[PDB]
Each structure stands twice: as structure tokens, then as C-alpha cells.
Amino acid sequence: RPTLREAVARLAPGTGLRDGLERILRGRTGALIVLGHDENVEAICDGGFSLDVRYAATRLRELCKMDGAVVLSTDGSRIVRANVQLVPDPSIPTDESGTRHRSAERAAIQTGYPVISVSHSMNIVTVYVRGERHVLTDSATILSRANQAIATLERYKTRLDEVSRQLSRAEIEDFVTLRDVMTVVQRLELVRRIGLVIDYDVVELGTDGRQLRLQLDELLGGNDTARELIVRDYHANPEPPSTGQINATLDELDALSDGDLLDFTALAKVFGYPTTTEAQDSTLSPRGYRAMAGIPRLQFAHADLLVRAFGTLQGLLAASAGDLQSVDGIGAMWARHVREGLSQLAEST
Amino acid sequence: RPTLREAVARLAPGTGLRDGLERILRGRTGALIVLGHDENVEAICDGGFSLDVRYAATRLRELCKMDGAVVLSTDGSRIVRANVQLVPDPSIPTDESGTRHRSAERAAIQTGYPVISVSHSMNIVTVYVRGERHVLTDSATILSRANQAIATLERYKTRLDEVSRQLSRAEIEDFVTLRDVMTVVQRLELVRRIGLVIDYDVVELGTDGRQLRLQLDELLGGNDTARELIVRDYHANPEPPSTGQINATLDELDALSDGDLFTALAKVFGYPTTTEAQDSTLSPRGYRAMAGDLLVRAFGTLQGLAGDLQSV
Amino acid sequence: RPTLREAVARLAPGTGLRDGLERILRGRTGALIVLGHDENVEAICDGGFSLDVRYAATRLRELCKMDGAVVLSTDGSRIVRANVQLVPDPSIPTDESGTRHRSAERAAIQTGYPVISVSHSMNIVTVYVRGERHVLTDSATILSRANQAIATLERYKTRLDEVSRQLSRAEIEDFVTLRDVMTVVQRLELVRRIGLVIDYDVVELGTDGRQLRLQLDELLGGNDTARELIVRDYHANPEPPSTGQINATLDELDALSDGDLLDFTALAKVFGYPTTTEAQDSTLSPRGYRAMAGIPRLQFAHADLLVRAFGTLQGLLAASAGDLQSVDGIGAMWARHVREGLSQLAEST
Ligand SMILES: Nc1ncnc2c1ncn2[C@@H]1O[C@@H]2COP(=O)(O)O[C@H]3[C@@H](O)[C@H](n4cnc5c(N)ncnc54)O[C@@H]3COP(=O)(O)O[C@H]2[C@H]1O
Ligand SMILES: [Cl-]
Ligand SMILES: [Cl-]
Ligand SMILES: [Cl-]
């Protein structure tokens, strides 16, 4: 049966239902709509008219001009009853206010289908699904909230870029420390989490969120790959981390609380380094995945072969073109390409 | 328990409740008021707040601005709860329309107390008492309707007086046709029936009916005695009817339909219903002339009517 | 008693009260609410009914449909009276218009508790707190005002950083003038004051200000420390400023009007220098507290003894390693760490 998130989706902008509800709000009639009909719904239905017509936004609006409730079919394709009096079991507990809304939630609990109440006085839509409630929000308000989050995401993306460049400078110089790696890990997670918040707003916006989706995907583009690469470079396991190991590490990062993200030792635990403050100053050596990703045109398949062969970024910098053409799967052309691409990083920083 | 009529009296003009209801109608807020509180009412009361204030029309109006129902104490002197949600058993049958009113009658049946709903859309007050319902009518409408009826009542009384003396003249002649008696009987019944219609309006008017109460009693008064005398004078049984016989006959006429009020009349009086029977001349007994019982049994007829009347 | 700012937070978005007030506005009934109840409130309360219910936004809306005023408990957790007639002392001064609002401000002054009046005609919420007034504003309008203010703050942050770099470069060169120091002082103050304006908007926005708070914290952060150090470095009194004296100077800066902050002579007076034109041209020498604060893990006790011995940053730079071990209370290891850090100032530029 419909879940709370699924029901909100059925009422998202661009849907036939949401069009009808918008019409009801402008009409200021109020409404009480049951999204489903079975034996249990009929049990609580009293009086009213039985009708069999196709759903239409306009048809719903007119029917809700009448006292009572409108029942739709489970698939949502039809309007099955109108002018109904709901009589849910009064023992079902609810903290809502007034006959309409208390009747709505009780009916939602008893039948198991979503129930919608529209307040004529407040012009507010509430949907009740099995003890949970959600109040719809105008697309403008959601956009305002999401654009504030987009602004913060713009600030976190700039901050991530600068610390990442600092880490890249340290990797070339061979003066990286756990603290340097974990500063980037934190900034990667902050970008990810604020991105998840904006994503929920995109879902709630429905068709009104299409542009916000494009902007969000552009800003978040490459964040997943950066999280993978940093795990691949600085994971306490001696051998290069396994693919499942990488997925395990990222899952632990998501499991961290927001407060834990502000703890560099909490992040160090996830990567497998000691949790002591002293451990933050210990020197690390990158494997070279991040640097290789910065080389233009270099497919990750080839970089994985080189990183496993030489072990460390410093080994790759010291390697000759002939040293980089002795790895199976690395041709002469790619050995030259990586050789000049690495020596360009050495000079630049 | 209070009866439907008793409840309507509690809501009549001149009462504190009716002052409150009139204010609610002008406010167009709608209302749902329970006239009584006990465990059974509380059982169906859900949410809301408890308060203990003296009843006042102004206080009732303010509290009914809120969603929900207001409960008063049984004596009606206090307001005990407001903003409550009534939750009567949906199995209780009702043919009312909408959440507010169906809940009102069900609550009235379940608790046994009067329940009032005021519709904001229709500005109509309905009172429910144990499966019965009454709709209040504006005192202005009742007054205007009742005054048209009182105007008719004087006309029925004048037309009754004119025909009654015609019958009395025939009594002198001894040639009173059966149709003549039933013409007077018809006018007596018509006066009685309009009198009952007006009486119901006077009660609903409360204090606004005080003047119509006096006017009604003057026109009617003497109607019961007149109906008793005419049955006592022109009853089929040659024996003078007993007091129980007279009251039984008067009840029989009341059972007649509006349209029937001459052949239908003759049969209740015991005369044959045939249209030929309505043509049969009758002889008055004389009770009416004396009013203008022991003596009449001696003489038998008005035609018989000093020592002979000091012999019985 | 609660202050005006405290009341504004209590009526901000995300609070139970604000949910009720939003409901009242949509109903267009108007309201008169007392945020507190004691014997003094009872004195001015007349008639009405006593109720004891838990506070709820929906309950408040229904009670404010009634003529009169609603009284809440001091903690705000309960609704104790409704339909009350306030009868505050007419002699209490007020500039509000009409019975409702004049009664509201007078009641606020007499009892000492916040009082809210909502105008049905104007759809405006007003809160009165002991002779002050605050009118609630749409969260959209506040956000628009605050985001522009954030834009100005980012520009103030950029100019602050560059003038700060100029001042530090001059400190090494020994060519700092009083005007240059006041250019940095002006920019630090401008950043601080626009920061306070945005802070008030964040409070008023409540839950709608969460993202704005994050942006504000990054832009400002470090502003207090920079103001403290600059006063510590360039204050006219020969004795190094005490911590309390520094706070006194900073309090004098806050007392200046927005117009005064554009006047370099007014700032010069706050630091004890003369207001003359000639004073602006005179060359100063930093005390060196800022440089010591940049040295990692150098407790201010070791910085105050060194600054008191040599007096100026140029004296600290001119000192030898042995000269930094002949100060009482400074160790040999600490003398090495301080000397190396000042040499890193040469690395800076
Ligand atoms: N049993 C009861 N106890 C206490 N107060 C009662 C009540 N029944 C009705 N009321 C009051 O009367 C208002 C108008 O009722 P009405 O049935 O015209 O107007 C109703 C009806 O058209 C519909 N509605 C409410 N509950 C319903 C239910 N269980 N089934 C179907 N329709 C319902 O929503 C309208 C507005 O509901 P809302 O509560 O805002 O407004 C209600 C409520 O404040
Ligand atoms: Cl609601
Ligand atoms: Cl119900
Ligand atoms: Cl709301």
C-alpha cells in the first residue's frame, strides 16, 4: 500500500491530483479526499453518491464543492464516490484539530490508504498515511529554501577546491599529513550532505524542480568520484583498497553524524588510521590515484594499473617513460603521455 | 427526560438561550450546542477545553465562533465545555445531511439531551430530541403567518355567528333541516382547527405571542361549549347523549379529514350518511335555547318549552 | 524580564507561537495575546473565562477567533485565559493608534511581559516589549534583504583581506603609517557591523535562517580575533594593552556611528593617537602580538614577556636566538621556535 513518500509523489507538481488540489485551493471550498477504495473504505463510508467516472482535475474540484468527502479508486484513475460522510472508528487516536482533519487521519489509519484534507480557512493541504502526516508546500517556498542551500553548496564547493589544491601541492612535495587528507575528506562530505538536502527538495518540487535538478547535477558533478579517489589514495590498508572496501568506507562516512564530521579523528577511524590527536600529524604517502586523475585524457583503467605497479606517487614521478611502459596494458603512447603529464605537475608546484 | 415541546419552550423568544441563538444567526458562524452534561455526554466528547462560566447570550455567541461544539449544564445556567468534538456512535441511524447535523441527532439520541445545530450556510436552527427534530422559525415569520390565520379566524367566527342564528330561527319554526345543523357544525369545526394551528404558533412565539394569546382566546372561547351543545341537541340516539357519549362524538369529528368538514358529518352524529338522509328534517332538543338537563328530559323537544317546570 | 530580542526569537519561524500566529493571520480575525501571567497581569485582566489547556497553535487560533485577549503562562507552555478585557492604566504613554494596539503596548509596559496584537484590517503582527516594538516580516522579504547584505559582506571581506596584506607587508618593511592601520581598522569594523545586521535577520528567520547562519559564520569568523590583535599591536599607550583595556577600546569603536567609521581621525582618537592630519602621516611600528599569535602553540604568556622586552616587531626580528633565551621565563626550546617563526615572516614576503 502507498507509503508516505510515495503518496507525496502522487501529489507532486505535474500530476493530475496536484492539479485538482490547486484548483480546490483557489476555489476555497475545502476538501476531504480518500486515495483508495476497498471493503475497509466502504465500511467507513456513509451516504453520498456512488459514481463511476474518469479522474479529471476539474471533476474533482466540482465534486469538492459539495459537503463531504470524495473517494478515488486505488489506481487513482477514477472517482468512485462523492458527497460521502466518513465515520472512522473514534477510538483511533489523533492529535489533529477539528472534525475534518481528525476524521481524515482516523480514516487514513483504519483503511490504510492516503487521505487528503484541504482547509478552506487556512488554504493548507495535509496528507495522512498510516500515522504519518505531510503538509504540502507551495513550489515557491520550496525553491526559496533550496536556493539558500544551493548558495551554501556554492561556498562549500569553492572551499573544497582550495583545500584539494593544497593537498595536491603537498602530495607533490611529499609533505602530506593525515590532517591534510582529512580536511579534504570533511569538505567532500559537507558538499555531499548539503547536496542530499537539495535533492529532497527536487523530488518535492516535481516538474517545478527540473531546472533545480540541472543546476544541482552540475555542482555535484564529480563529487562521488572525488570521494572514491581520496579513499583509494589514503586508506590504511597496505594494498590498494578493494572495490568493496571503498564502498564500505563511503557507507561508514554516510553513517557519521553531522557532529562527527567536525571531528577529524572520527574521519580517521573510517579510513583505518588511529583516532589519537597525535595521529593527525603523522606523514602519509599518496598512492597516486588523485594525481593520475588530474592528467588529461588518462582513463582510470590505465591509472589503476600504474598505481598498483609503482605503489606511491613519488615512485611514479621518479619513473621513466620506459619504466612506465613495462606495465602490461600501458603502451608506449600512454607511457609518454603520463610521463609528461606528471613532470608538468612537478614544475607547476 | 424533556420532551420535544419542552425543549422548544426552552428556546422560545424571551429566554436567554434564544437570545444567544439569535446572536449566532446574525454572526453567521454556525453552532452545535448540547443542552446537558453527564457521563454519557462526556463519553462522546473529544478534545476541547473545560470551562465553568455563567450562561450569557453574549458568552454563547463568542464561544460558538470556534470550531466544534459548546456544552451547557442541564439546568442551562452554565457553560461547561467549548470547542469539543462530538463523536457519537455512527451505528445510530439518522437521515440528516452533513457532518454537523448528522452528528447532532446521533449525539441527541445517544445522550438523551436536546442538541441544537445552527447552519452557517442556511441560517436555520434545528433542535433534536431523541430521534425527533424541530426547526425554529423567525419570530417575524411566525407573527405574520399567525396574523393571517387570526384574520381568518374572526371571519370564521362571524360566518359562524350568522349561520347559528339562522339555525335558531329554524328551531322556532320546528322545521330545521338536517343540512341546516351541519352547516353550523362545519363552521364550529373550522374555527376549532384554525384555533389549534394558531395556538402552536403562539407557543413558539414565546413572549412575542402574548398579544396573540389574548386575541386567540377571545375568538375561540365558547367553542367547546358550542360543540358540546349541538351534539347534545342533534344526536341520533333518541336518548339524550351522556357526557361520555358527547366527548366520544366530539373526538370522532376531529378524526375527519379537512375535506369532509356534509354526509361525513351526518354519519358521526349517527344520522344515515345517504344524501337522502341529509334532506331529512330534524327537531331540536332545546339545550341550546336553555343556554341562551333535567328540564329537557321532561319536555323532550324545544316545542314543549311554570308549574310543569317546578314538577320535575 | 524578556527583552525585545528575546521576544523576536520566541515568535520566529519554527516556534509553536509563530505557527499559531501564522494561523491567526490566515483567518484574518485579529488577536491580542499576553506572553506571561502573574498577579500583575491579573490586575489588568477583566472578565473573560479561565481555562487550563496545553498550548497548541491550533488551540490559539480558535481562542483568538473570540473577541478579547488570550493570556499564556510565563513559560509559554499553557493557555490560561481567553476572551479577557485588558484594562491597563491609561496614563502609561503610547504612540499606537486605536484601542487594541494602545491597550497592547500599555499592557506590555505595565506587566513587563510581551504582548502581541494582530490587526485584522492590516494583516500585521506587532509585539510590544517594555516600550519597544517589533513588527514581524515575511521570511521571503528578510531573506532577500539578508542575501544582498551577505553580498556586501563578501565584498567587505575581500577588501579587508587585501588591505590586511598591505599592512603586514609594511610591517616587515618598517614603513607602516597610522593611516594604513586605520584603513585595516575601518574594514574590520565594517565587516563586523554588517555581520551584526545579518545576525539579527538570522534570528528573526528562525528555522528559515539555518543556511544563512552557516554562510555568516564563515565570512565573519576570525573578525573578533583580528580586531583584538590590531588593538594589541597599535595602541598609543606605551604599556602593552591589558585584555580589559582592549575590550574598552573595542567598545569605543562600537560606540562610533556608521558615519564616523569613514573618518580616519575619529578612529585615531579611539586608539589614543591625535586627530590631526599630521598624525595620520606619522609612521608607527607594530608591537608584535599579531606575529606571535601566528606562531603555533605559543602561549600568550611567552609572547607577552618577549614583546615587553623588545617592544616592537622589528626588535623581535632583530633579536638573535640567544637574545630570546635571555628573557626570564622563556625556555631554550621556546626561544628556537619563536626565532624560526619570525624567519617564516621573511618567507611570507
Ligand atoms: N461531530 C462534530 N463535532 C463537533 N463539531 C462538529 C461536528 N460535525 C461538524 N462540526 C463542526 O461544524 C463544522 C461544519 O460542519 P459541516 O458538516 O457543515 O462541514 C464539514 C464537512 O463538509 C466536512 N467533514 C468534516 N468531517 C467529515 C467527515 N468525517 N466526513 C465527511 N466530511 C467531513 O468538512 C467540513 C468542515 O469540517 P470542520 O471540522 O472544519 O467544520 C465543522 C465543525 O467545526
Ligand atoms: Cl488544521
Ligand atoms: Cl464522527
Ligand atoms: Cl501553517
Tab-separated table of C-alpha atoms in Angstrom, chain A residues 204-323:
chain	number	residue	atom	x	y	z
A	204	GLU	CA	9.118	17.504	-3.611
A	205	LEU	CA	9.094	20.065	-6.435
A	206	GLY	CA	8.191	17.545	-9.132
A	207	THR	CA	8.041	19.254	-12.523
A	208	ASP	CA	8.808	22.609	-10.895
A	209	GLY	CA	12.204	21.178	-9.921
A	210	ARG	CA	13.554	20.275	-13.365
A	211	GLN	CA	15.848	23.316	-13.591
A	212	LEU	CA	16.975	22.927	-9.993
A	213	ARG	CA	17.865	19.353	-10.915
A	214	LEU	CA	20.101	20.512	-13.769
A	215	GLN	CA	21.938	23.031	-11.600
A	216	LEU	CA	22.311	20.539	-8.764
A	217	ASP	CA	23.733	17.812	-11.004
A	218	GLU	CA	26.272	20.284	-12.414
A	219	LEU	CA	27.525	21.416	-8.996
A	220	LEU	CA	27.597	17.889	-7.535
A	221	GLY	CA	29.208	16.534	-10.717
A	222	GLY	CA	32.439	14.740	-9.839
A	223	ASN	CA	31.843	14.698	-6.086
A	224	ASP	CA	31.295	10.939	-5.998
A	225	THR	CA	34.470	10.292	-7.996
A	226	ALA	CA	36.472	12.550	-5.680
A	227	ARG	CA	35.261	10.636	-2.622
A	228	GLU	CA	36.289	7.358	-4.244
A	229	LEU	CA	39.711	8.636	-5.275
A	230	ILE	CA	40.610	10.009	-1.849
A	231	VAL	CA	39.656	6.681	-0.262
A	232	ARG	CA	41.752	4.913	-2.891
A	233	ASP	CA	44.738	7.111	-2.014
A	234	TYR	CA	44.756	7.261	1.789
A	235	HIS	CA	43.261	4.054	3.191
A	236	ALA	CA	45.200	2.399	5.995
A	237	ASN	CA	45.158	-0.991	4.238
A	238	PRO	CA	48.661	-1.570	2.784
A	239	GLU	CA	47.470	-2.978	-0.542
A	240	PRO	CA	45.372	-0.562	-2.641
A	241	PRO	CA	41.820	-0.637	-1.285
A	242	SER	CA	39.374	-3.117	-2.781
A	243	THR	CA	36.222	-2.002	-4.574
A	244	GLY	CA	34.012	-3.434	-1.846
A	245	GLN	CA	36.346	-1.902	0.723
A	246	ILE	CA	35.811	1.511	-0.884
A	247	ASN	CA	32.029	1.053	-0.757
A	248	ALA	CA	32.314	0.046	2.896
A	249	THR	CA	34.324	3.181	3.743
A	250	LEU	CA	31.912	5.535	1.997
A	251	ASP	CA	28.989	3.850	3.773
A	252	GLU	CA	30.652	4.475	7.132
A	253	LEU	CA	31.144	8.118	6.180
A	254	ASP	CA	27.429	8.449	5.411
A	255	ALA	CA	26.683	6.810	8.767
A	256	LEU	CA	28.604	9.520	10.608
A	257	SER	CA	26.543	12.214	12.282
A	258	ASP	CA	26.946	15.845	11.273
A	259	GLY	CA	28.810	16.479	14.518
A	260	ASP	CA	31.128	13.544	13.882
A	261	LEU	CA	32.145	15.135	10.577
A	262	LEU	CA	33.577	18.037	12.592
A	263	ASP	CA	35.886	15.512	14.296
A	264	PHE	CA	38.982	14.716	12.249
A	265	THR	CA	39.644	11.673	14.439
A	266	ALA	CA	36.149	10.372	13.628
A	267	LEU	CA	37.020	10.570	9.925
A	268	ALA	CA	40.416	8.973	10.602
A	269	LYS	CA	38.712	5.949	12.177
A	270	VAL	CA	36.694	5.396	8.990
A	271	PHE	CA	39.872	5.323	6.879
A	272	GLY	CA	41.579	2.985	9.346
A	273	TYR	CA	44.095	5.342	10.942
A	274	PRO	CA	44.461	5.788	14.707
A	275	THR	CA	41.962	8.025	16.478
A	276	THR	CA	44.554	9.909	18.553
A	277	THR	CA	45.180	13.617	18.068
A	278	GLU	CA	48.878	12.823	17.686
A	279	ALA	CA	47.990	10.629	14.699
A	280	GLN	CA	46.810	13.714	12.809
A	281	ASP	CA	50.432	14.854	12.411
A	282	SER	CA	51.721	11.537	11.050
A	283	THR	CA	53.010	11.709	7.487
A	284	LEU	CA	51.189	9.816	4.722
A	285	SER	CA	52.189	8.914	1.168
A	286	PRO	CA	49.523	9.041	-1.564
A	287	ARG	CA	49.111	6.122	-3.930
A	288	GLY	CA	48.667	8.435	-6.925
A	289	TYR	CA	45.056	7.905	-7.959
A	290	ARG	CA	44.170	11.580	-7.465
A	291	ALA	CA	47.207	12.874	-9.368
A	292	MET	CA	46.637	10.470	-12.254
A	293	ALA	CA	43.012	11.614	-12.470
A	294	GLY	CA	44.311	15.159	-12.962
A	295	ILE	CA	46.292	14.066	-16.022
A	296	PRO	CA	44.177	14.871	-19.112
A	297	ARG	CA	42.843	12.011	-21.232
A	298	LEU	CA	44.023	9.283	-18.822
A	299	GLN	CA	41.350	6.617	-18.400
A	300	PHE	CA	41.121	5.268	-14.853
A	301	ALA	CA	41.754	1.729	-16.109
A	302	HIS	CA	45.336	2.621	-17.043
A	303	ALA	CA	45.900	4.693	-13.893
A	304	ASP	CA	44.840	1.737	-11.746
A	305	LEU	CA	47.488	-0.412	-13.438
A	306	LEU	CA	50.214	2.196	-12.872
A	307	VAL	CA	49.237	2.936	-9.273
A	308	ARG	CA	49.295	-0.728	-8.312
A	309	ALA	CA	52.642	-1.256	-10.051
A	310	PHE	CA	54.646	1.613	-8.525
A	311	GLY	CA	52.774	1.952	-5.237
A	312	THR	CA	53.319	5.623	-4.495
A	313	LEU	CA	53.032	8.965	-6.249
A	314	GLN	CA	56.728	9.641	-5.615
A	315	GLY	CA	57.560	6.386	-7.377
A	316	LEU	CA	55.531	7.497	-10.393
A	317	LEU	CA	57.275	10.880	-10.555
A	318	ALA	CA	60.690	9.197	-10.456
A	319	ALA	CA	59.660	6.718	-13.162
A	320	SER	CA	60.989	6.990	-16.687
A	321	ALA	CA	58.855	6.534	-19.789
A	322	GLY	CA	60.499	3.129	-20.170
A	323	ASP	CA	59.687	2.362	-16.550
